[PDB]
Design a protein around this ligand. Structure first.
Ligand SMILES: [Cl-]
Ligand SMILES: [Sr+2]
Length: 357
């Protein structure tokens, strides 16, 4: 059925890219199909199953954004207000002029991609934030940043008067039914934890780091993410505030060439060519500052769009795609960091083969 469309494309993808294992969820109106492929660990040959946990890396940022947006709904966080307002430890710094909205759309004044080596903890981090000088016009330039989204998650935590991961647990994960979603994988589940594989074919597993939780830290299943995507597509039974919070994450906030930057979710109007999609996942978009223009009639979630998000670690490769107007979504997790082109193409082929595009 679905499986007849899906299975040969994933088989071809897994061969062409030498991916040990994948887990795939297709959300549609009529229900969700979970499919598992290959080995969770290439060495042992243990198959991927219902309980296999994958690093999603940068995909974690959508959870961070969801929780942020939920603090905003509850009236505890204002997205427009300066960050120093909820983190007063940063008064007098650049963050008097940078907002939570800026942080969730990567328009926080050129905040770099990585946490610098010198920053080894929260104190050295806040100190680094205090000193840092912007290198690009705030709100007019997009630079993909772990420092920024992470700061959004500190700010959100602060404003809800709690710590990040337990607050995320109670307010987003648990209500969505995402009990296989872990920031720190418990001892009992380690046998379910997929082993990753880099582009030279080496075993690799993410290491702890500052802001790992807020930026790239989740390990989870395809089904759990299907629950988030399900909510986004309004096919879930969810609390009304959480549902607004989730919907608010899909508001277009800035234009960046062909791409509309929402709250971490990136989107494109239909019809869209795969090349455009590839451009959005490429060096030019990810590793360079790109002019951004704030959307002034600020856009309600659209229903004629490709909404997507990539996630990688050194040994894992994930991608989510949502077509809100067809109530259709795709979660593909892999335990190999395989190129973003292969992701967009496999996605497109899948969704086109199903007739969603
Ligand atoms: Cl980093
Ligand atoms: Sr941490």
């Amino acid at each position: 059925q679905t499986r007849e469309v899906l299975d040969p494309i994933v088989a071809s993808l897994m061969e062409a890219q030498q991916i040990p294992g994948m887990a795939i969820a297709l959300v549609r109106p009529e229900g969700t199909t979970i499919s598992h492929y290959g080995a969770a660990d290439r060495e042992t040959g243990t198959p991927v199953d219902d309980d296999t946990l994958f690093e999603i890396g940068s995909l974690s940022k959508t959870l961070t954004a969801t929780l942020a947006s939920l603090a905003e709904v509850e009236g505890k966080l204002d997205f427009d207000a300066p960050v120093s307002r909820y983190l007063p430890e940063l008064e007098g710094s650049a963050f008097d002029d940078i907002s939570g909205l800026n942080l969730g759309t990567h328009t926080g004044g050129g905040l770099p991609l990585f946490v610098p080596d010198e920053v080894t903890d929260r104190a050295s981090l806040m100190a680094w934030y205090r000193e840092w000088q912007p290198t690009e016009p705030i709100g007019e330039s997009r630079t993909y940043s772990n420092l920024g989204i992470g700061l959004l998650g500190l700010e959100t935590a602060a404003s809800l008067d709690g710590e990040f991961v337990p607050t995320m647990r109670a307010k987003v994960l648990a209500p969505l039914g995402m009990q296989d979603t872990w920031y720190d994988v418990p001892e009992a589940r380690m046998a379910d934890y997929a082993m990753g594989e880099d582009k030279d074919g080496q075993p690799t597993r993410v290491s702890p780091g500052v802001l790992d939780d807020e930026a790239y830290g989740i390990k989870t299943t395809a089904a759990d993410l299907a629950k988030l995507v399900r909510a986004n597509l309004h096919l879930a039974d969810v609390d009304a505030e959480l549902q607004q919070a989730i919907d608010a994450t899909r508001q277009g906030h800035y234009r960046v060439g062909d791409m509309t930057q929402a709250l971490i979710w990136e989107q494109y109007s239909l019809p869209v060519a795969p090349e455009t999609l590839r451009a959005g996942q490429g060096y030019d978009m990810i590793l360079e500052p790109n002019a951004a223009e704030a959307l002034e009639p600020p856009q309600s979630p659209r229903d004629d769009v490709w909404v997507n998000k990539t996630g990688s670690t050194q040994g894992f490769g994930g991608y989510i795609v949502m077509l809100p107007g067809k109530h259709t979504g795709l979660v593909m997790l892999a335990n190999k960091n395989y190129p973003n082109d292969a992701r967009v193409e496999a996605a497109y082929r899948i969704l086109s083969g199903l007739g969603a595009i």
